[model samples]
Each structure stands twice: as structure tokens, then as C-alpha cells.
Target: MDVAGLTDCGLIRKSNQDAFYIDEKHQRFFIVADGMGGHAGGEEASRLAVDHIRQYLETHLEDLQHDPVTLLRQAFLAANHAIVEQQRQNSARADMGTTAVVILLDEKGDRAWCAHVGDSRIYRWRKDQLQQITSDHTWIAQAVQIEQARQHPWRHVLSQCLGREDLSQIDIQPIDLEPGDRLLLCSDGLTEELTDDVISIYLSEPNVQKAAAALVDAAKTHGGRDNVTVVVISV
Candidate 1:
């Protein structure tokens, strides 16, 4: 498998609050996060979750070697715990939170799993078809389908995320892959600025670097409302 990831601060924002990790060895994992809080907390929160999740996977290397799904769950749980502990040390960041999404693989590469919280997403492109693996945990998305949510004002109101609670609920599921399969993990920053169809067109590019770069460049053309982070992996 090959992966290319890129994160940008976009047109506006005092700082970039998005983070990602791509680990090609050990338990193959690619993760992306979008954080919300004051500037300091947002940046720290995203960086915190990504590193914590990566560390947990390595620390429990044996569990990851045995159970990919459960390993991902534990890693995310540990990340949230780490953030909650940090929040305790600084109540000023009581409002800190973030959305996270990941694509996890087994040591032997026999199975694949996708896990997420909030709107940062994971999408699969296989056989020339694109499919989203996780649903957004936002007020508008939870209240109705995504198309309908576009008509409402609360579209961006998140219902769940890492910092929403010490142990917030996250969606985790398995997805089948083929030799020609492609997977994408990104923050809502990209989705909010670009439509799904536009994303599909970019992922159609065979090179991971071009696909990931084009996604962010195109998103910026569409107003670039927030930070944009994208990861494209091909097998």
C-alpha cells in the first residue's frame, strides 16, 4: 500500500489545528483529526490525540497483532483519556474537543477497519465507485440525512467527538478491500469546502500525492472556510 497525506491551515485561521499520522510499519494506521477550542487548546488537542493514539497502538503492539478492531478501540479510548487528563490540568480548555478518523490494518494485512468520531471522515474508492464508511456525529447529520442537513443552520453543530466526553462513543467497522482499492481519511475542513463529487474526481488520480494535493488545492478554490487535511492510500 502507498499513502500520501497533507494538511494546510487554509485561507483563514490564526493557526492550523488539524493533525494526522501515517504509520506504514507495525500495525498500519492512518489518522486525521480536526480540533476545536481556543487557538492554544485546538492545536494542542489535535496534536495530543494523534500522538496518543499512535503511542497506544505501539505500546500495545501485541494486542494490535492479535485484534485489529479491539486494538483500534483501545487506542482511541486511550487518546480521549489522555486529553481528558490534560483538560483536568487546565480548566481554561474545558471546551477543547476534536473530531478523529482512522484506517487501521492488521500486521498480516488480512483485514481492515475504520473508526471515527465527529465529521472528519473515511471514504473508500474501489472499482471506480466511492463510498463513505462513517456517518458524521453532528446535530444536523444525526437529525436527518446529509442532503437534508445542508438546508439547516445547525449543520456544523457536533454531537460527539474525543473531547465531548472522557470516553465519547466512536464508530468502528470493518471494510473489505481489493488490490486496486483506495481509501481517504480527512477532516470536515475538506468536506465543508468541497462536495463529495469533487472529492471523487480528485481521488480518481492514480498517484496518491497528486490525489491528496489536488483535494486541498481544489478545496481552497471553493473558499477554503477552514483547515484542510487529506490522506490518500492505495493498495
Candidate 2:
């Protein structure tokens, strides 16, 4: 698998609060975290989540079965615990939570698994079909679904996220990958600005790097109100 990632502060934010990590060897593990809170707490929370999860995986890799989904879930829960502990110790970091999406490719490279919290998303593209693998744990998503049931526009709201003490549940899902399939992991910053059709058109482009770049660029062009981050993986 070949991977490329990019992040931008967009047009409105003074700083980027999003964090991500890529492990190229020993089963490709890619993660993108978008944080929400005041000041730099959001940024710090996201950074901490990635760092702690990576560290835990590094030491526990051998113990994990080749099941990417299981590993992803364990790592996410570990990150949550670490963040909650930190918040308990320091009042300054209190109430800081983030949205995280983690993807792991199987050792054989034929399958991929994902785990996510909050609104960050993962997409799988095969042939001409593009599908979203993870659901948004936001108010807007829930509202949209509810409104849809009532014949209204899908209001964007998140029902869950990381770093928040109240949100205890997380969503974990898996996707089987084909040799030519493309997977994208990104924050709400990009999706909030660009529609699914626009994103599908871009991902269909031949160049993954350019597609990644174009996605962020389009988000910035559309008033970039939040920090934008995206990772594209081609299998």
C-alpha cells in the first residue's frame, strides 16, 4: 500500500488542531484526529491521543491477532483512557475531546479495518463506486437522519466524540480491500465544505496525491472555517 497525507489550517483558523500518524511497516496503521475545544487544548488533546495510541501499539503489536478491527478498537480505548487520565490530573486540559478515525491494513494487505469516534470519516472507492465506511457520531448526523425520516434536510450534528467525558461509546467497522481500491481518511473540515459527489469526482482522479491536495484546496476555497486533514491510501 502507498499512502500520502496533508493538513491545512484553512482560511479561518489561526492554528491547526488536527493530528495524524502513519506507520508504514508492520501492518499499515493510519490515523487522523480532529479536536474541539477552546485555546490550544484541542490540538494538545489530539496530539496526545495519537501519541499514546501509537506507543501502545508499538509495544503490543505481537500480542494482537492479525485482526485489524480488534487492534484499532483496543488502541482507541487506550487513547481515551490516557486522555481522560490526563484531564483528571490537569485542570487546564479539562473538557478537551477530539474526533479520531483509525485505519489498519491487514498483514496480507487484502483487507482493511477502521475505528472512529465523532465526525471524522473513512471512505472506500472501488471501480466507480465510492462508499463511506464509518458513520458520524455527531448531532448533525443524527439530526440529518432524523430529519430525513421526517422528509427534512439532513442537519449536521455530532452525537459522540473523543476527549469528552460523556461520550463513552465508539464506532468500529471493517472493509475488505481490493488490489486497486482507494481508501480515504479525513476530518469533518474537508467533508463539511465539500459535497460527497464532489469528493467522489476528485478521488476518481488517477493521481492520489493530487486528489488529496485538491480536496484540501477545495475546502480552503470554500471558506475553510476549521483545520483540514486528509490521508489517502491506495491498495
Candidate 3:
């Protein structure tokens, strides 16, 4: 499998509040986090989550021998605890949390599983069809699901994310993958601006890097109002 990614502060934000990490080897774990909070605490929370998760996976690859879902759930819990502990230790960090979407490429690189919190998303592209593997844990998403809003109207509001104690109520799900599958992990900044069709067209281009670049450009062209981050993985 091959991977490529990029993160931008976008046209409006002063700093990139999003963070991401990719491990090209050893199961190809990739994570994208979008932070939300006052001051730079959002940045801190996201960076911490990415760093902690990457470090944990590197040190505990043996743990993967267990059920992948169980391993990912435990990893998410550990990340949540680390962020919570950080906030507890410093009053200034309070209320700061992030949205995290994690994908782990299996040993064979042909299959994968993912877990997410908040609005950050994981998309799977197969044979020209694009499917969202993780749902947003946002109020808008719930509203739409409950028939309270139009099909695409709740893209802006989020219900849950990392770093917030209130987010513990949401559960994570695992997605199965296959070869010739291309997975995307991105922040709402990208999705809010570009439609799934646009993304599918660009991502399907022969050049993955150009596809990633086009995705970012598309977001900025549509008034990039937030930080944009994306990770593209092909197996």
C-alpha cells in the first residue's frame, strides 16, 4: 500500500488546528484530528492525541493479535484518558478537545479497520463508488438522522469530539476493507466545501498526489473557513 497526505490552515484560520499522522509500515495506521476549543488548547489537544496514539501503537504492536476492534477501542480509550488527564492537570486546558478518525491497515495491507469520534471522517473508494465508513457524532448529523433537518443541512454542527468529557456517550464501529480500496481521512473543512462527487472524481485520478492537491484546492476555492487536513491511503 502507498499513502500521501497534507494539512492546511486554509484561507481563514491563523493557525492549523488540525493534526495528522501516518505510519507507512507496520499495519499503516493513520490518524486525522481536528481540534476545537478556546485559544490554542484545541491545537494542543489534537497534537497530543495524534502523538499519544502513534506512540502507543509503535510500542504495542503485539496487542494487535487481539480482535482489531477491541484493540482500536482500547486505543481510543487510552487517548481519551490521556487528553482528560492533561486537562485535569492544567486549568487552562479545560474544555479543549478534538475530533479523531483512525484507520489501521491490516497485516496484508488489503484490509483495514477504523474508529472515529466527532465530525472527522473516513471514506472508502471502491470501483468509482465513494462510501463514508464513519458517521459524524454531531448534533446536525443526529438531527438529519431523526428527520429534524434536510439531508445535507447539518454539515456544520458537531455533537461530540475528543477532549470533552461529554463525548464519552458515543460508541465506535469498525469497517472492513479490501484491495484496490482507497481510504480517505479528512476534517470537515474538506467535506463541507467539496461534495462526495467532486472528491470521488479527483481521488480517482491517476495521480494520487494531484488528487489530494485538487481536494485541498477545491476546499479553498469554496471559501475555506476552517483548517483542512487529509490522508489518502491506497491498497
Candidate 4:
């Protein structure tokens, strides 16, 4: 798998609270996180979430049958527990929390698995079409299906995330990869500014490095309301 990742502080944010990880070996694992930016411990929460999950996946490789799916769940839960523990140890970081999306691929690159929480998204592009693999844990997304729910102003609010008392539920799925398939794991920053159609155009680029950079550049060109981070993996 080919990998390219970059993170940027948008024009409006005081700090960049997003974080990402790319496994050094065969591009096995990739992660993207967005810390609750308006509160204390935002940066630390995201950093630790990525660190804890990455380390867990890097070290725990005992079983193959359930390795990717089971361990992906374990890694997400581990990250959640670690972040909540950090908050418990320090009252000032009580409001700290983040969203995480993780993608793992088999050594041969024929199969991929993904787990995610909150709003960070994972996309699969094949045959010139893009599909979103994860659902947002936010109220707006929940209500998006119901036309009337748009009346609620809190629709934009997040309903699930790490650091909450109960953060165990995470969406997990397996994907079959083809030779020309492309996968993207990203923070909400990029998605917030660029629509899926626009993203599909750049993600289709032959160069993985240029695709990742161009995605961020397009996000910044549009409003860049929040921190933007993108990780693109080629199969």
C-alpha cells in the first residue's frame, strides 16, 4: 500500500488538535483523530488516542483469524479507556475527548478492515465511485435521514466520542480490495470543507502524495473552519 498523510491548522483555529498515525511496516494501519478543540486537553487527548491505538496494534499480534477485526475493536476501546483515564487523573482535562477512525489492511493488501467513532470518516473509491463506510455519531447525522429533525439546532452536536463514561460502541466492517481501489481515512476538517464529489476528483489522482496534499489544499482554499488532516492509502 502507498501512504501519504498531512495535517494542518485551519485559518480559524487557534491550534491544531487533530492527529494521525501511519504504520511503518507495509502500511498495515492508519489512524486519524479530532480532539474536542474548544476545551482543555484537546491536543493531548488526540495525541494519546493515536498513540495508544497505534501501540496496541503494533504490539498485539497473537491471533490471525480474529486479528484485524477483534484487535481493531480492542485498539479503539483501549484508546478510549486511556483517554478517559487521563481525564480521571486530571480534573482539568475532564472535558477532553476525541473521535477516531482506524483502517487496517492484510499483508497482501487484498482485504481491509475499519473501525471508527464520532465523525471522522473512511472512504473507499473504486471504479470512479466513492462510498462512506462509517456513520457519524453526531446528532445532525442521526437526524439527517429524517427531514424534520433538521429543525433542532443541536443537530450539529456530537453524541458519541472517546472519554465519555461509556465509549465502547464502535462501527467495524471488512472490505474487499481490488487492484485499483483507494482508501481514505480523515478527520472532519477535510470533509467539512470539501464535498464527496470534489474529493473524489483529487483522490483519483495517480500520485498518492499529491492526492493527500491536494485534498488539504482544497480544504484550506474553501473555508478551513477547523483543523484538517488526511491520510490516503493506495491498494
Candidate 5:
């Protein structure tokens, strides 16, 4: 297996509010988060989200080893609570929140589980096609099909996210992998600047490290206006 993760503070953002983690030693999990709020709040929320999730996975791995789906869901919930607690303690961060996407692989890396909240996404590339694995938790995505929602001015309005009191469920799914399959976890920054077709081509590259770097460079070249983070895992 080959894995690579990258993050860039795009051209417009003063601070990169995106955070990501790769369990390099274990190769058991990976995460990507995009933060929203003021600069400090956004940065803090994303960092906290990734930190809490990573800690939860590490601590519960022994108990939840047999149930990755449950493990992933609980991890996301824990991250949400951690962010919400931060908001309660700091008035300036009251509005801070984040979109999170995570993937967990088993011991041998044959099967995988995914979890997500807000607009961050997980995608699978197989049979020469790109398939989106997580749906955005946005008002526009909720009311209309993706094509129609693209025209909505409020498309980016998130209906659910970490740090929101209303957050109750995390989207979790099982993924069946083939020998040549590749998975991608990313923030909206990359998606916003590049089309699905473009992303598909980039992700299809054989070199995981090159693919990750190319994706970030392409996003920046195409007018990156937000923090971009990407994790590429191939099996």
C-alpha cells in the first residue's frame, strides 16, 4: 500500500484551516478536516477535530477492533463533542465548526470503512472511474440534486458539522476494495477549484505522492481561495 497526505494554504486564505492525519506506522486510519469561522477559530476547530479523532481511534482500537464502523462513528462523535466544548469555553470560537472525513482500514487492508460530516468528502477510484462515497451535509445538497444545487447561491451553507449542537448522526459506510482501487479524502478546497473529471485524471496517477502534490498544485493554479487538504491511499 502507498499513502500520501498534503495540505496547502491556498492563495486567498491567510491561514490554512485544514488539518489531516495519517496513521503512518499502523496504516489503519486517515483523516481530513476543513475548518470554518474566524482564522483562529477555524484553525483551532480543524486541529481539534483531527486531534480528538486520532486520539479516540488510538485509545479505542483495542476495544473496537472488531467494529470499525462503530469505531469510526464514535470517533466522529467524540471529535464533535470536543469542538463543541471548545466553543463553550471560548466566546470568540462559538461559531467555529468543521467538515470531517475519515477512513479506517483493517489489519490486512482488504476492506475499509468511511465516516464523514459537513461538506468534506471521501471518494473511491476503480475501473477507471471516480465514485463519490460521501454526500455533503449542505442545505443545497439536502434539497436538490447536485447538478441543480450548483446553481443555488447558498450551496455552501452547511446543515450539519462538528461543533454544532444539532449534530446527531455521522454518515458511515463500508467500502469493498479491489486490488487496484484508490481512495481519496479531501476538503472542499480541492473540489472547488477542480472539476470531478480533472480530479479523476489526477487521482489515477500511479504515484501516490505525486498525485497528492499534483492535486494541491493544480488547485492553487486554478485560483485556490481556501485551504486544501488531501489524503491519497492506494491498495
Candidate 6:
């Protein structure tokens, strides 16, 4: 497998609130988070969420009794707990929250899994076709059709994410992996500047490193309105 990840502060934001993690050695899982709140709060929330999730997955990787989907869900919940704990400790970050998307690969079982909250997304590119894996957990996404939701005023307002007690159901799904499938995980920042058509074009690059870089650079060139992050894994 070939893997590459990149994050850019973009041309507008003074500080980046997006965070990501890649299990470089084992390629077990990948994570991307887009945080909300003020500067310090957003940054901290994303970082803490990624850290906690990574830790939880690693600690439980050896437990064969747990199903992969169950383990992945627990990992996300653990991250949410870590974020809530931090919020309790610091009153200033009380409103801090984040959108998280994670993809776990079970190499031995020849299967894959995806779990997410809010709008950060995962896309699978297979045989020249790009398919969105996770749906957005937003008010517009639920209230309107996808095309209309894209232009709705409340599109960016998330209906779910970490740091909320009611965040009970996580969107989890099984992914079909093939010999030449590529997975792209990203925050909304990239989508804010580029459309799916453009993204698919950039992702068509054979080299994972170049595909990752070009996506970030193109977003920056267009507007760079927000912090952008992307992780590309080719299998």
C-alpha cells in the first residue's frame, strides 16, 4: 500500500483547527477531524480527539473477540469522552467540538470499516469511479436533498459531533476493498474550495504523495478559505 497525508493552514486562517492521524507502520486506521469553537478551543479539540481515538484503537487492536465495527465505534466514543473531559477541565473550551471521520482496515480479514460524526468525509476511488463513503451529519443534509443541501444556508451547521452528551449513534459502514482501490479522507475545508469533480481528477494521480499534495495546493490556489487536510491510501 502507498499512503500519504497533508494539511495546510490555507491562505485565510491564522491557525489550523484541523487534525489527522495515520497508522504509518501498520496501516491499521486513519483519522481526520475538523474542529469548531474559538482558536485555542478548536485546535485543542481536534488534536485531543485524534490522539484519544488513535490510542483507543491501538490498545484494543489485539482483542480478537471484538468485531471491527464495534471496536471502531468504541474508539470514536473514547475520543468523545476525552474531549468532554477536557471541556470539563477548562471552562473556556466548553463549547469546543469536532467532526471526525475514521477508516479502519482489517488486512487479515480482507475487510474495511468507516465511522464518522458530522461532516468530515471519506471517499473510495475504485476502478476510476469515486464514491462517497460517509454522509454528512448536518441540518441541511437531513432537511433537504443533497443538491439543495450543498447550497443551503445551514449546510455548515452540524447536527452531530464530539463533545455532546447526545452523540449516541455514529455512522458506521463496511467498505469493499479491492486490489487497486484508493481511499481519501478529508475535512470540509477541502470541499469548501473544490467540487467532487475536481477532487476526483486530482485523486486520479497514481502517486499517493502527489495526489495528496495536489489536492491541498489546488484548494489553496482557489481560495484557501479554511484549513484543509487530506489523507490518501492506495491499496
lDDT of 5 at 102: 91
Which residue runs of candidate 6 sit more than 4 Å off their true CA positions?
64-66, 145-150
lDDT of each: 0.84, 0.80, 0.80, 0.86, 0.90, 0.88
Record all residue pairs in model 4 with backbone atoms less than 3 Å apart, i.e. clashing: none
Model 5 segments more than 4 A misplaced: 145-150
Candidate 6 whole-model C-alpha lDDT, 0 to 1: 0.88
Q: What digit string (tens of lDDT, one per residue) describes model 6 on residues 24-108? A: 9899899999998774999998998899989998898888315877787888899889889888888998999998999888856
Question: Clashes in model 6: which pairs?
Answer: none
Point to the candidate with the largest lDDT: 5
TM-scores of the candidates are 0.93, 0.91, 0.91, 0.93, 0.96, 0.95
Residue-level lDDT of model 4, residues 98-203, one tens digit each, is: 9999888876778888889889999999988989998888877877776573445765577888878777578889989998889999888998899999999999
Better of 2 and 3 by TM-score: 3
lDDT of 3 at 207: 66
lDDT of 1 at 107: 58
Model 2 lDDT tens row, 1-235? 6687899999988988898888866546888999866757788789988897788777666678465556767788888887788778778878777889888666677777788897899999989788899988856466664455442344444567766566667777667888988899999898878988888888877787888898899888987988999998888
Tell me the deviation in Å of residue 77 in model 5.
1.7
Model 4 ranges off by over 4 Å? 37-40, 62-65, 148-152
| Candidate 4 lDDT | 0.86
Task: Give model 2's TM-score versus the native structure.
Answer: 0.91
Q: Model 3 reaches what TM-score against the true structure?
A: 0.91
Name model 3 segments beyond 4 Å from true.
Answer: 148-155, 169-171
Q: Which stretches of candidate 2 lie over 4 Å from their true place?
A: 149-157
Estimate, for each residue in 54-164, the C-alpha lDDT of model 5 and write its tens digit. 999999987897988888888888989999998999998899999899998877778888899989999999977999999988877887753563445887788889998
Best by TM-score: 5
